[PDB]
Amino acid sequence: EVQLVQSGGEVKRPGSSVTVSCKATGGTFSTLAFNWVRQAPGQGPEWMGGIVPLFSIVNYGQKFQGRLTIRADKSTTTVFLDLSGLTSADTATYYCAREGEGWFGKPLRAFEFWGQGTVITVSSASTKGPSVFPLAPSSKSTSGGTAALGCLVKDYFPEPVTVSWNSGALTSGVHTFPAVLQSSGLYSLSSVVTVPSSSLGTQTYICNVNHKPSNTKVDKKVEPK
Amino acid sequence: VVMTQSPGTLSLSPGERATLSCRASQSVSGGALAWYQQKPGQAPRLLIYDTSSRPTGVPGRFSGSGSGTDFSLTISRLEPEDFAVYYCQQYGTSQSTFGQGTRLEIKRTVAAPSVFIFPPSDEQLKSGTASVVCLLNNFYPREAKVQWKVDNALQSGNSQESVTEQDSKDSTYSLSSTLTLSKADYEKHKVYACEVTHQGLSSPVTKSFNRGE
Amino acid sequence: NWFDITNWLWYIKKK
């Protein structure tokens, strides 16, 4: 197995510097080119730079020059990424990718092996748990049709939040939307579920919101109006 | 060198033939073009390197072609797991660049979104803010326009939208548009509506509620 | 091009 194990996610303040590691195990290291490629939320990959660990021959993107530093440790087979002067435009997922080997290990230049990624959230906002508000099913629901209810997971930092329904018993018809970054610097998402209208008055629906960075576990009961 | 992929979104059927285009702003030296596939939440997977060569493990239905400034990826038979985002990357120079990507999704019948409007809750109202949530459940295609009307006043700049991924069972999308207001501005008005314009709708459908009814 | 550097070493090392 040729595996690339990166460091954990991190929340950095604007202007600071971050270091991301990349442990390469089970393959050639020195004579093969590693690369750092980041990807913003909702956008595509963007190549940032690379290094050849043998003689530490680095190649930085013109956009990131003066602000990027890629290093290699041949003794421990690790590739690093130093990025200074962090801004909101640097909040992304950073992947470390090694090129591929072909006939007799011919360096194919293209990136074949990738790490699991490192999520970097460049924001000052203090770690906060979410306020869960019920999206009650409408009183004008179709008699004998379909109803919709849910919970609003508003104002929390940072990502992520795991949402379940009835402790995980209810899964069908559940839509947990991707979170959006509000102007206040906090995140917010909504998790809805569609149920038969004939069960609104008897069945009890409870949404379970769990936020690990704030150690917050909220159970909210949604009932009709 | 600026890579431009085409089209933006490719809607085809499972088992059909797929062709994605990649156009470079200048000539790519030595045929240094690669095609990567990426599923949501995963790192990209190298499908094609050096214009047409295929790494070990990639099935034979993927084939690359082209030269100079025009390149093309061809999936001869679209399988269920072949629908994802595809990125072409050049690397002939010292500065590699990717493309904006092509979204290869599943084509299906046009489905009208089920629209549900939700007023803010009292527990949220006592906190100082009010969120009115409009929900568009299960529709196709994913292009839909949501518009907020607070007493027939068009809102703009105070509502955020988010769309789920294409569902693995019915190939439909779900959209959520939240309108955030202060409690003062929320109580200065009464009628709150969210009107939706979609391809699977003959007329824009408006879901409204009067505050306190 | 830097991406070809690792190839030189591949050639020179192989021969």
Q: Which domains does chain B have, with CATH numbers?
A: 1-108 (no CATH), 109-213 (2.60.40.10)
Q: Which one-letter DSSP state was computed for residue A128?
A: B
Whose tokens are 């059909």? That residue is: B16
Residue pair B22/B71 in contact by the 8 Å Cβ criterion: yes
What separation in angstroms does the CA of B74 have from each of B4, B51, B59, B100, B119?
17, 12, 12, 18, 48
Question: Cα separation of B105 and A109, whole Å?
Answer: 29
Torsion angle of the four alpha carbons A163, A169, A173, A175, in this order, in degrees rounded to the nearest 10? 10
- Which chain A residue's Cα is nearest to B58? A112
For the domain made up of A125-225, the CATH class stated in words is mainly beta
The one-letter code for the residue type at B79 is E
Whether residue C2 and residue B32 make contact (CB cut-off 8 A), yes or no, is: no
Report the 10 Å Cβ neighbour count for B132.
23
Indicate yes or no: CB of C3 within 8 angstroms of CB of B29: no
Q: Using CA atoms, how far apart are residues A151 and C4, in angstroms rounded to an integer?
A: 53
Which parts of B41-189 fold into alpha helices (H)? 122-125, 183-187
For residue C2, the chain B residues in CB contact (below 8 A) are 94
Q: Answer whether A3 touches B (CB < 8 Å).
A: no
- Dihedral sign computed on CA atoms, order A72, A77, A81, A82: negative
Strands (E), chain A: 3-6, 10-12, 18-20, 22-25, 34-39, 45-52, 57-60, 68-73, 78-83, 92-101, 107-114, 118-122, 131-135, 146-156, 162-165, 174-176, 180-181, 187-196, 205-211, 216-222
The alpha-carbon gap from C4 to the nearest alpha carbon of chain B, in Å, equals: 9
Q: Judge contact between A29 and A74, C-beta under 8 A.
A: yes
Residue A63: both structure tokens together:
């956009």
| Resolution given for this structure, in angstroms | 3.4
Which residue intervals of chain A bear CATH 2.60.40.10? Answer: 125-225
Provide the residue type at A202 as one letter: T
Looking at chain A, which residue has its C-alpha nearest residue B116? Answer: A148
* A180 CA: distance to closest CA in chain B (Å): 7
DSSP state of B188: T
Burial class (CB in 10 A: 0-12, 13-18, 19+), B121: buried
Closest-approach residue (CA) in chain A for C11? A106
H-helix or E-strand containing C14?
A: helix C5-14
Beta bridge partners of A180: A188
